[PDB]
């Protein structure tokens, strides 16, 4: 299996999610619309990024490795949308949204910058991202969880489930960064890409399907 | 949970197939060190994959 | 569930270490085919291990 | 890591379980005693079998492979004790016990016999074991589940949890037989042994710990 084949699989998986989220949302009132639209943006952006890589664009040589710019650009655009979706469920205000989106953006910017740095100092950038990520996790399991606990049962339950998916799975990405091409390159480029396709699909499309399943249930009682 | 499990079970064999293909391709080379390289990647990758699957499962069948 | 997960996470890296040792030992040989052999075993083994861990998890955090 | 090292790990794990089950049972009345004793037999027998293999005994050359007689002898003795434990929870009568122990014994006898057969006809013996196993699974999820559903809530809940552990995990053993030394030998002897140690530990010691945890809870309310 070649890299471009894996990228095409990523694009198709994301498209399938996008179509599912769009159509599920056709049944949505003023209160639910923004959630469905957010899911469409998340998987739609990812679908296009995967197409870009599958078409052989954005493969950046860095020293003796290859870094995929569209991967990191996707994350910069889509992870704050996931954080936004979570913050909506939690019932955050603008100031709270600003904090978590900022922490999120620092992680993705640092990780992208580090991947693009040839020298050993790329690990300093990783480190900056890792600290910001611990801050984001704190916000997710602390303050945001406290905010979510004030909302309805169905909403609190969805928040916790999506929060758990997000915290556990997002924590795997930095290990793939460290062990893969940007770090010590113990994972082959193929295994690196395959792991990220699966992980992206679960954190975006799996996340969305969990939300779709909960939304149908709340509306049907 | 069912659709979740066969999704997990099927993607694991599909990942194992990719890893196996990498090892066989390296084997076709005749270079032992190349095979070790593909194998170390496959082992690390499969360990990470457990983490992902376990993470997904714990997250969906937990509460 | 906690004690269950770190049991699962820790045994996976311990299994990966055994598998890795087998691949390195085969690598030390210089025989590419030997490494492929150790690698195919490691890949199948890690896939089965997912099944065991997933089975354990589904069985304990399910009902 | 050598085979004997893995066998020693198996023996120690089983001993730890045995000590735990013995001591937990010190707090047990007439109604609970037989369950704790059954767990002690299960892990105790397994502990000794592992010691026997670790000491280099029972390694049987078969064609171009090595089969471990004590592995199969352990299973012949301990799996009917696990089936017995499940049947007690389910509330089976002697005739029902006889059926499931018989089906269980056919699986283990067939698998042992097949492992000891050099020729291709060993797969016929595997096949006989596999059919008997489907029968055992039916009994576990059908009739035995129906019997269990007539008992208290706490008992039915423990039965289902242990039943699920057992059905899912026991189903993995025949794949290890097929892919390992007794079958097509795609798993190395080391990986074969390592998988079986882990699997044995979960199906015996994990099973027991789940039971211990439930027993403490039922007695504490
Ligand atoms: C849809 C894509 C998702 C949800 C991407 C998530 C990516 C991360 C959580 C990455 C985290 C990183 C760190 C914590 C350290 C620096 C390396 C990163 C950017 C891979
Ligand atoms: C403590 C040991 C346990 C619970 C052993 C369980 C072993 C089995 C469920 C084996 C099943 C087999 C088949 C279904 C087919 C023939 C090969 C066997 C014996 C490995
Ligand atoms: C249904 C869309 C295809 C998804 C394939 C995902 C493969 C992940 C890499 C292993
Ligand atoms: C069922 C909806 C079909 C049309 C959706 C188009 C979404 C394209 C995303 C890019
Ligand atoms: C060949 C090197 C050039 C790298 C250019 C990167 C191309 C843009 C990637 C965009 C991926 C995200 C898509 C988001 C917009 C919708
Ligand atoms: C857990 C996997 C470890 C893989 C090897 C990573 C090697 C570099 C780790 C550095 C992480 C902290 C950053 C230190 C900055 C100097
Ligand atoms: C990564 C380890 C972080 C240690 C802090 C643990 C916080 C537990 C909160 C309950
Ligand atoms: C509501 C209790 C606060 C939990 C803090 C968790 C700390 C996470 C460390 C990363
Ligand atoms: C049991 C729940 C686990 C939650 C994990 C949240 C914290 C993630 C910590 C890992 C961050 C990556 C840095 C690794 C450096 C080596
Ligand atoms: C009880 C909660 C229900 C969760 C159902 C969602 C399961 C998602 C499975 C992962 C899907 C990943 C993307 C697949 C591409 C098609
Ligand atoms: C889910 C995180 C697992 C990362 C790999 C662990 C083993 C690293 C050994 C070097
Ligand atoms: C849990 C059962 C998995 C058995 C191995 C599956 C892959 C076999 C390919 C030959
Ligand atoms: C605590 C007793 C030791 C258990 C080790 C189990 C190792 C399984 C093989 C992988
Ligand atoms: C806590 C009980 C200590 C003595 C138990 C002896 C069990 C030995 C099993 C053989
Ligand atoms: C060298 C070949 C001889 C094989 C003899 C097998 C030895 C007996 C194994 C006993 C394992 C089960 C222990 C149960 C009794 C307690
Ligand atoms: C699923 C893993 C398959 C591994 C290869 C097994 C090869 C033999 C399978 C035979 C099973 C049925 C018995 C047929 C008797 C003739
Ligand atoms: C191994 C496949 C067996 C197919 C029968 C499925 C029975 C489902 C019972 C509900
Ligand atoms: C209570 C309903 C009966 C379930 C039968 C399950 C069949 C299992 C096939 C193996
Ligand atoms: C989803 C729950 C799975 C329960 C499995 C119970 C049935 C086990 C079937 C496998 C028996 C081994 C024979 C394999 C032959 C190839
Ligand atoms: C909620 C149910 C609680 C289950 C706790 C039991 C978990 C067992 C973990 C596996 C142990 C295997 C043997 C370890 C050797 C020491
Ligand atoms: C993809 C489907 C996710 C839907 C999650 C809905 C969570 C928010 O719930 C919505 O909030 C509205 C207020 O803004 C209220 O009208 C209701 O509580 C509900 O419609
Ligand atoms: C290892 C701990 C497992 C304990 C499981 C106990 C399940 C059976 O429960 C026991 O059955 C007795 C009748 O025989 C009754 O006195 C009670 O229901 C209970 O003590």
PDB file of N, CA and C in Angstrom, chain A residues 57-100:
ATOM      1  N   UNK A  57       0.689  16.865  -3.181  1.00  0.00           N
ATOM      2  CA  UNK A  57       1.008  18.249  -2.875  1.00  0.00           C
ATOM      3  C   UNK A  57       1.241  18.455  -1.382  1.00  0.00           C
ATOM      4  N   UNK A  58       2.204  19.312  -1.050  1.00  0.00           N
ATOM      5  CA  UNK A  58       2.511  19.596   0.339  1.00  0.00           C
ATOM      6  C   UNK A  58       3.426  18.602   1.033  1.00  0.00           C
ATOM      7  N   UNK A  59       4.087  17.741   0.265  1.00  0.00           N
ATOM      8  CA  UNK A  59       5.049  16.809   0.847  1.00  0.00           C
ATOM      9  C   UNK A  59       6.374  17.548   1.008  1.00  0.00           C
ATOM     10  N   UNK A  60       6.702  17.982   2.220  1.00  0.00           N
ATOM     11  CA  UNK A  60       7.853  18.868   2.390  1.00  0.00           C
ATOM     12  C   UNK A  60       9.110  18.138   2.868  1.00  0.00           C
ATOM     13  N   UNK A  61      10.172  18.161   2.049  1.00  0.00           N
ATOM     14  CA  UNK A  61      11.403  17.524   2.518  1.00  0.00           C
ATOM     15  C   UNK A  61      12.021  18.324   3.655  1.00  0.00           C
ATOM     16  N   UNK A  62      12.349  17.637   4.737  1.00  0.00           N
ATOM     17  CA  UNK A  62      12.985  18.274   5.878  1.00  0.00           C
ATOM     18  C   UNK A  62      14.118  17.363   6.288  1.00  0.00           C
ATOM     19  N   UNK A  63      15.345  17.844   6.112  1.00  0.00           N
ATOM     20  CA  UNK A  63      16.519  17.019   6.346  1.00  0.00           C
ATOM     21  C   UNK A  63      16.364  15.703   5.584  1.00  0.00           C
ATOM     22  N   UNK A  64      16.396  14.585   6.305  1.00  0.00           N
ATOM     23  CA  UNK A  64      16.239  13.274   5.681  1.00  0.00           C
ATOM     24  C   UNK A  64      14.841  12.686   5.899  1.00  0.00           C
ATOM     25  N   UNK A  65      13.848  13.553   6.057  1.00  0.00           N
ATOM     26  CA  UNK A  65      12.488  13.063   6.201  1.00  0.00           C
ATOM     27  C   UNK A  65      11.489  13.883   5.385  1.00  0.00           C
ATOM     28  N   UNK A  66      10.249  13.417   5.367  1.00  0.00           N
ATOM     29  CA  UNK A  66       9.184  14.113   4.672  1.00  0.00           C
ATOM     30  C   UNK A  66       8.075  14.475   5.652  1.00  0.00           C
ATOM     31  N   UNK A  67       7.757  15.765   5.704  1.00  0.00           N
ATOM     32  CA  UNK A  67       6.704  16.287   6.577  1.00  0.00           C
ATOM     33  C   UNK A  67       5.520  16.705   5.715  1.00  0.00           C
ATOM     34  N   UNK A  68       4.304  16.440   6.177  1.00  0.00           N
ATOM     35  CA  UNK A  68       3.144  16.780   5.372  1.00  0.00           C
ATOM     36  C   UNK A  68       2.509  18.046   5.877  1.00  0.00           C
ATOM     37  N   UNK A  69       2.821  19.153   5.208  1.00  0.00           N
ATOM     38  CA  UNK A  69       2.221  20.439   5.544  1.00  0.00           C
ATOM     39  C   UNK A  69       0.684  20.396   5.645  1.00  0.00           C
ATOM     40  N   UNK A  70      -0.005  19.727   4.689  1.00  0.00           N
ATOM     41  CA  UNK A  70      -1.468  19.793   4.806  1.00  0.00           C
ATOM     42  C   UNK A  70      -1.999  19.108   6.055  1.00  0.00           C
ATOM     43  N   UNK A  71      -1.284  18.121   6.584  1.00  0.00           N
ATOM     44  CA  UNK A  71      -1.684  17.482   7.844  1.00  0.00           C
ATOM     45  C   UNK A  71      -1.788  18.522   8.949  1.00  0.00           C
ATOM     46  N   UNK A  72      -0.724  19.310   9.102  1.00  0.00           N
ATOM     47  CA  UNK A  72      -0.657  20.280  10.189  1.00  0.00           C
ATOM     48  C   UNK A  72      -1.585  21.460   9.943  1.00  0.00           C
ATOM     49  N   UNK A  73      -1.766  21.818   8.676  1.00  0.00           N
ATOM     50  CA  UNK A  73      -2.680  22.902   8.319  1.00  0.00           C
ATOM     51  C   UNK A  73      -4.132  22.488   8.596  1.00  0.00           C
ATOM     52  N   UNK A  74      -4.486  21.261   8.224  1.00  0.00           N
ATOM     53  CA  UNK A  74      -5.766  20.660   8.614  1.00  0.00           C
ATOM     54  C   UNK A  74      -5.969  20.824  10.125  1.00  0.00           C
ATOM     55  N   UNK A  75      -4.993  20.393  10.924  1.00  0.00           N
ATOM     56  CA  UNK A  75      -5.182  20.396  12.383  1.00  0.00           C
ATOM     57  C   UNK A  75      -5.378  21.793  12.910  1.00  0.00           C
ATOM     58  N   UNK A  76      -4.611  22.738  12.371  1.00  0.00           N
ATOM     59  CA  UNK A  76      -4.740  24.126  12.794  1.00  0.00           C
ATOM     60  C   UNK A  76      -6.158  24.659  12.572  1.00  0.00           C
ATOM     61  N   UNK A  77      -6.811  24.174  11.523  1.00  0.00           N
ATOM     62  CA  UNK A  77      -8.153  24.644  11.176  1.00  0.00           C
ATOM     63  C   UNK A  77      -9.276  23.851  11.834  1.00  0.00           C
ATOM     64  N   UNK A  78      -9.064  22.550  12.033  1.00  0.00           N
ATOM     65  CA  UNK A  78     -10.152  21.679  12.471  1.00  0.00           C
ATOM     66  C   UNK A  78     -10.191  21.451  13.981  1.00  0.00           C
ATOM     67  N   UNK A  79      -9.027  21.345  14.611  1.00  0.00           N
ATOM     68  CA  UNK A  79      -9.024  21.183  16.071  1.00  0.00           C
ATOM     69  C   UNK A  79      -9.686  22.350  16.824  1.00  0.00           C
ATOM     70  N   UNK A  80      -9.511  23.601  16.364  1.00  0.00           N
ATOM     71  CA  UNK A  80     -10.293  24.592  17.119  1.00  0.00           C
ATOM     72  C   UNK A  80     -11.807  24.448  16.895  1.00  0.00           C
ATOM     73  N   UNK A  81     -12.218  23.878  15.768  1.00  0.00           N
ATOM     74  CA  UNK A  81     -13.643  23.587  15.565  1.00  0.00           C
ATOM     75  C   UNK A  81     -14.132  22.474  16.505  1.00  0.00           C
ATOM     76  N   UNK A  82     -13.281  21.487  16.766  1.00  0.00           N
ATOM     77  CA  UNK A  82     -13.637  20.436  17.730  1.00  0.00           C
ATOM     78  C   UNK A  82     -13.717  21.011  19.139  1.00  0.00           C
ATOM     79  N   UNK A  83     -12.752  21.852  19.486  1.00  0.00           N
ATOM     80  CA  UNK A  83     -12.766  22.517  20.784  1.00  0.00           C
ATOM     81  C   UNK A  83     -14.008  23.413  20.909  1.00  0.00           C
ATOM     82  N   UNK A  84     -14.347  24.090  19.812  1.00  0.00           N
ATOM     83  CA  UNK A  84     -15.578  24.897  19.748  1.00  0.00           C
ATOM     84  C   UNK A  84     -16.837  24.065  19.998  1.00  0.00           C
ATOM     85  N   UNK A  85     -16.936  22.926  19.320  1.00  0.00           N
ATOM     86  CA  UNK A  85     -18.079  22.020  19.509  1.00  0.00           C
ATOM     87  C   UNK A  85     -18.208  21.607  20.986  1.00  0.00           C
ATOM     88  N   UNK A  86     -17.076  21.276  21.602  1.00  0.00           N
ATOM     89  CA  UNK A  86     -17.039  20.862  23.008  1.00  0.00           C
ATOM     90  C   UNK A  86     -17.435  22.018  23.916  1.00  0.00           C
ATOM     91  N   UNK A  87     -16.954  23.209  23.583  1.00  0.00           N
ATOM     92  CA  UNK A  87     -17.248  24.396  24.367  1.00  0.00           C
ATOM     93  C   UNK A  87     -18.717  24.788  24.295  1.00  0.00           C
ATOM     94  N   UNK A  88     -19.333  24.560  23.141  1.00  0.00           N
ATOM     95  CA  UNK A  88     -20.770  24.791  22.996  1.00  0.00           C
ATOM     96  C   UNK A  88     -21.539  23.854  23.901  1.00  0.00           C
ATOM     97  N   UNK A  89     -21.144  22.582  23.912  1.00  0.00           N
ATOM     98  CA  UNK A  89     -21.813  21.624  24.782  1.00  0.00           C
ATOM     99  C   UNK A  89     -21.601  22.041  26.221  1.00  0.00           C
ATOM    100  N   UNK A  90     -20.383  22.464  26.552  1.00  0.00           N
ATOM    101  CA  UNK A  90     -20.079  22.826  27.936  1.00  0.00           C
ATOM    102  C   UNK A  90     -20.794  24.100  28.395  1.00  0.00           C
ATOM    103  N   UNK A  91     -21.134  24.967  27.445  1.00  0.00           N
ATOM    104  CA  UNK A  91     -21.829  26.207  27.771  1.00  0.00           C
ATOM    105  C   UNK A  91     -20.840  27.300  28.136  1.00  0.00           C
ATOM    106  N   UNK A  92     -19.711  27.326  27.438  1.00  0.00           N
ATOM    107  CA  UNK A  92     -18.687  28.339  27.681  1.00  0.00           C
ATOM    108  C   UNK A  92     -19.095  29.733  27.200  1.00  0.00           C
ATOM    109  N   UNK A  93     -18.517  30.753  27.806  1.00  0.00           N
ATOM    110  CA  UNK A  93     -18.645  32.132  27.335  1.00  0.00           C
ATOM    111  C   UNK A  93     -17.450  32.512  26.493  1.00  0.00           C
ATOM    112  N   UNK A  94     -17.477  33.687  25.896  1.00  0.00           N
ATOM    113  CA  UNK A  94     -16.451  34.073  24.923  1.00  0.00           C
ATOM    114  C   UNK A  94     -15.027  34.051  25.491  1.00  0.00           C
ATOM    115  N   UNK A  95     -14.896  34.435  26.745  1.00  0.00           N
ATOM    116  CA  UNK A  95     -13.612  34.495  27.391  1.00  0.00           C
ATOM    117  C   UNK A  95     -13.047  33.119  27.623  1.00  0.00           C
ATOM    118  N   UNK A  96     -13.917  32.185  27.955  1.00  0.00           N
ATOM    119  CA  UNK A  96     -13.553  30.784  28.132  1.00  0.00           C
ATOM    120  C   UNK A  96     -13.214  30.134  26.790  1.00  0.00           C
ATOM    121  N   UNK A  97     -14.028  30.409  25.769  1.00  0.00           N
ATOM    122  CA  UNK A  97     -13.709  29.972  24.411  1.00  0.00           C
ATOM    123  C   UNK A  97     -12.329  30.470  23.986  1.00  0.00           C
ATOM    124  N   UNK A  98     -12.024  31.726  24.308  1.00  0.00           N
ATOM    125  CA  UNK A  98     -10.772  32.333  23.884  1.00  0.00           C
ATOM    126  C   UNK A  98      -9.568  31.622  24.476  1.00  0.00           C
ATOM    127  N   UNK A  99      -9.687  31.223  25.738  1.00  0.00           N
ATOM    128  CA  UNK A  99      -8.600  30.550  26.431  1.00  0.00           C
ATOM    129  C   UNK A  99      -8.296  29.192  25.804  1.00  0.00           C
ATOM    130  N   UNK A 100      -9.325  28.364  25.629  1.00  0.00           N
ATOM    131  CA  UNK A 100      -9.108  27.018  25.098  1.00  0.00           C
ATOM    132  C   UNK A 100      -8.715  26.994  23.635  1.00  0.00           C
TER     133      UNK A 100
END
